[PDB]
Ligand binder design. Structure first.
Ligand SMILES: Nc1ncnc2c1ncn2[C@@H]1O[C@H](COP(=O)(O)OP(=O)(O)O)[C@@H](O)[C@H]1O
Ligand SMILES: O=S(=O)(O)C[C@H](O)CN1CCN(CCO)CC1
Ligand SMILES: OC[C@H]1O[C@H](O)[C@H](O)[C@@H](O)[C@@H]1O
Length: 477
């Protein structure tokens, strides 16, 4: 069984969010579980420099110009790179320029990603050919389309990590991407009078996967599908939609071995976490105080994440005696709002705007609560990281958060199953109730400790996830 993942990022080489974490860990899990998994990525500078043993497999001409297909290894997994410097050798973000504008040739940059994914099924590499092309998110959405147009020389799975990113391009670009014009149809890749790469992935794949069981159910609803629900309802009825929960990479997210921490610790030695908290407070400019709960955010700052609710809830949180440490980058309204909060409440609110990989570990390892009040959340990896680090997740019951966190209710505490704090509605009052719940449990230190140890007993394993994908791949044949 040979599988090629087609995607635009991979931890630790290039990361803008959880997708990178997935691609960095799943393939090695699949190999352990008996599937020859390989990865296809554009040769962005950071990726190209990480894969030091990469060799030439072939040169091709393409609707988007020439590629050199490279193959090397990273952390033992086979990595193909699309070297096309005219498309991919640009600084910063893979998706947009310095001014945060999408590249004007994005249609070509990502149509090419899908195209190479599909070519691989036809022998682009004379030495290896995937049985299944596994495409991730809109960026790779054309791969099942090129496969369909070639008579499906391999099976395809499409996994949605986030349905809110649709890969919308003007219809005239059908001219530029070498797909049958007949594909521009509602029974095809057309969506609201434009090309959608997301629609393409959803429509042409043999099977669609979402990144949690409940997100898979949610995307059949208008509220979470944004127009795509009709397609998704049909694919569900056909038995072509399913949810496979993400795992966590233990090599990197384990307080037991985390080299980025002031102090390592375990489920049975949580007293060793205290030093991380002290150093976090010092680093953030917070009052150094072990009697007070430290709430935390590590997050992209977009409306998905419900962090406007945190801004609203903040006075209530501070009034009860809590602290907030935030790390994040995104909407300037959010950035400025949180910066204003830190200025207004020095020693109670610490804020760091930007992307800081190492600093997220020090927050995860020092904080008491991780706020994930998402409006929607396909999976959420930060709350899984919180569980593992005994930093109790406070979450909205939506998507993967609904699948992974158990509220501190009477039954859950009595059944020994409670692991965090759950609220229902996307408003600050509903959030503030879960926050109050946290303060109440905080006032009972041995119950807090009991919930911490249950959080740390939760297991999110890539090799277990691998087993589900494997069933899928064999089912498709
Ligand atoms: N500002 C940041 N600095 C460092 N890491 C971040 C930052 N924002 C998000 N992350 C990381 O990116 C990943 C986010 O994944 P996830 O919670 O699945 O949400 P999303 O993929 O929607 O961003 C986590 O590993 C998280 O720690
Ligand atoms: O905004 S774009 O559509 O131009 C590019 C991406 O969709 C932005 N991302 C990166 C991939 N994503 C998953 C990150 O884990 C969603 C946000
Ligand atoms: O699948 C990895 C990640 O994909 C997307 O970025 C989602 O926004 C996030 O919830 C998920 O954890």
């Amino acid at each position: 069984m040979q599988v090629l993942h087609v995607c635009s990022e991979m931890f630790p080489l290039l990361k803008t969010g959880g997708l990178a974490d997935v691609i960095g860990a799943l393939p090695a899990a699949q190999i352990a579980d008996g599937v020859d998994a390989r990865v296809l990525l554009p040769a962005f500078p950071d990726i190209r420099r990480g894969v030091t043993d990469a060799q030439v497999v072939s040169r091709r001409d393409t609707f988007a110009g020439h590629i050199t297909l490279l193959f090397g290894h990273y952390n033992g997994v086979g990595i193909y790179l699309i070297d096309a410097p005219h498309l991919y050798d640009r600084p910063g973000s893979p998706y947009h320029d310095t001014n945060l504008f999408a590249y004007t040739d994005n249609v070509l940059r990502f149509a090419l990603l899908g195209w190479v994914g599909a070519e691989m099924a036809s022998g682009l590499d004379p030495f290896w050919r995937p049985d299944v092309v596994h495409a991730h998110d809109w960026h790779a959405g054309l791969a099942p389309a090129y496969l369909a147009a070639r008579g499906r020389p391999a099976k395809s799975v499409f996994t949605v990590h986030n349905l809110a990113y649709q890969g919308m391009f003007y219809a005239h670009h059908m001219n530029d991407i070498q797909l049958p014009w007949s594909f521009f149809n509602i029974h095809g890749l057309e969506f609201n009078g434009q090309i959608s790469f997301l629609k393409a992935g959803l429509y042409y794949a043999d099977h669609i996967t979402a990144v949690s069981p409940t997100y898979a159910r949610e995307i059949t609803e208008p509220q979470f599908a944004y127009g795509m629900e009709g397609l998704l309802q049909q694919r569900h009825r056909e038995g072509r939609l399913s949810g496979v929960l993400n795992g966590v990479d233990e090599k990197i997210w384990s307080p037991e071995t985390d080299l980025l921490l002031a102090s390592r610790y375990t489920r049975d030695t949580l007293e060793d976490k205290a030093e991380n908290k002290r150093q976090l407070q010092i680093a953030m400019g917070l009052k150094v105080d072990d009697k007070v709960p430290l709430f935390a955010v590590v997050s992209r700052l977009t409306s998905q994440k419900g962090l406007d609710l945190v801004l609203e809830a903040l006075p209530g949180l501070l009034e009860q005696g809590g602290q907030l440490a935030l790390l994040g980058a995104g909407d300037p309204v959010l950035q400025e709002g949180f910066l204003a909060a830190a200025a207004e409440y020095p020693g109670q609110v610490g804020v760091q705007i930007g992307y800081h990989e190492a600093f997220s570990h020090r927050i995860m390892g020092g904080a008491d609560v991780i706020l994930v009040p998402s409006r929607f959340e396909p999976c959420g990896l930060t709350q899984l990281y919180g569980l593992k680090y005994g930093t109790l997740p406070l979450v909205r019951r939506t998507g993967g958060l609904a699948d992974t966190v158990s509220d501190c209710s009477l039954e859950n505490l009595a059944d020994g199953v409670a692991s965090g704090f759950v609220f229902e509605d996307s408003n600050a009052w509903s959030l503030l109730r879960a926050i109050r719940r946290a303060f109440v449990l905080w006032s009972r230190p041995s119950l807090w400790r009991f919930v911490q140890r249950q959080a740390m007993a939760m297991d999110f394993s890539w090799q277990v996830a691998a087993k589900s994908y494997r069933e899928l791949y064999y089912r498709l044949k």
